[PDB]
Design a protein around this ligand. Structure first.
Ligand SMILES: O=C(O)CNC(=O)C(=O)O
Ligand SMILES: [Mg+2]
Ligand code: NI
Ligand SMILES: [Zn+2]
Length: 331
């Protein structure tokens, strides 16, 4: 078995190897990459997502989110308070302000320590989940706006034609902005490109050990657990590396820098934070190996997680028994 310790793998494709997205994903899995839940891909040196970022300040962040924490430093929840619209130029200036900017630090490790010690005492503002793309239409390789769609994957593998579309999303981050512990909708893959700015640190649990993280989360967030059998789909719960180590949960960590891709694999729980002002683009995708994960994916039926138009069809076809109760939650 390849990669039996489930370490995060890093790949350096040539420009020749960068032409066929599906085939490269299948190559990474042949080497065991999926066992970690997360992989890094450094694009060939010849490749670029676009020519410059010089004219992005007029993108609108219609609903910036203030991420307010409750709990203790290593075990907390976050809620998202909606704020007034601002442009990316306005947001970048705010991120750079004395109130919100990255503190002095020695290296990524010292910054990680400061994040876990101090996150709960501040409320950073995240421009998340904005439909759109920063890839130039002429970028032909690994353009997250030109990928094969999950509806077309399901049709190719299973023969059924369904409604829905699949488009990318932009994320504008600042120091301390946080993504809570989750897997993707329907336990899909994700791919994330860091277009610009400061790094993003990731934590991940190997798919084969996901249930260990779920059991710890039920212990640590006991009222949330009683309210919903799939509450990590609410994307609100944080657990520190120290706490994970204390409870014997297998995990790994890595820092993504500007110009790098990350891939998350089906049922790979992940969480993380931004080091400073940055912009990432991400999209879900599928391969033939995902189908069985989609069939087994948990669902939120309490009504909090409230998800896309296109996830309807996935549930209807892959989970027809759940269909009914899940759409009661989504209506
Ligand atoms: O970048 C973020 O805030 C969150 N991204 C992801 O969870 C992802 O790409 O799967
Ligand atoms: Mg602009
Ligand atoms: Ni994700
Ligand atoms: Zn729920």
């Amino acid at each position: 078995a390849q990669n039996p310790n489930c370490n995060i793998m890093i790949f350096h494709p040539t420009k020749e190897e960068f032409n066929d997205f599906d085939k490269y994903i299948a190559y990474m899995e042949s080497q065991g990459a999926h066992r970690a839940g997360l992989a890094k891909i450094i694009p060939p040196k010849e490749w670029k997502a676009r020519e410059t970022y010089d004219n992005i300040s007029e993108i609108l962040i219609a609903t910036p989110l203030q991420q307010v924490a409750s709990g203790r430093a290593g075990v907390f929840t976050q809620y998202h308070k909606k704020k007034k619209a601002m442009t990316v130029g306005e947001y970048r200036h705010l991120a750079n302000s004395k109130k919100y900017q990255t503190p002095p630090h020695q290296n990524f490790e010292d910054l990680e320590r400061k994040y876990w010690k101090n996150r709960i005492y501040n409320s950073p503002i995240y421009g998340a989940d904005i439909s759109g793309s920063l890839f130039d239409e002429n970028t032909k390789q690994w353009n997250l706006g030109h990928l094969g769609t999950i509806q077309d994957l399901l049709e190719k593998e299973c023969g059924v034609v369904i409604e829905g579309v699949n488009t990318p999303y932009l994320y504008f981050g600042m120091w301390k902005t946080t993504f809570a512990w989750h897997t993707e909708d329907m336990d899909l893959y994700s791919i994330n490109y860091l277009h610009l700015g400061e790094p993003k640190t990731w934590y991940v649990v190997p798919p084969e050990h996901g249930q260990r993280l779920e059991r710890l989360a039920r212990e640590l967030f006991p009222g949330s657990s009683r309210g919903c059998g799939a509450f990590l789909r609410h994307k609100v719960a944080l657990i520190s590396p120290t706490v994970l180590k204390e409870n014997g949960i297998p995990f790994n960590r890595i820092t993504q820098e500007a110009g790098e891709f990350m891939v998350t694999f089906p049922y790979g729980y992940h969480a993380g934070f931004n080091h400073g002002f940055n912009c990432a683009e991400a999209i879900n995708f599928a391969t033939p190996r995902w189908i069985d994960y989609g069939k087994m994916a948990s669902q939120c039926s309490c009504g909090e997680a409230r998800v896309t138009f296109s996830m309807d069809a996935f549930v209807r076809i892959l989970q027809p028994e759940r269909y009914d109760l899940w759409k009661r939650g989504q209506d």
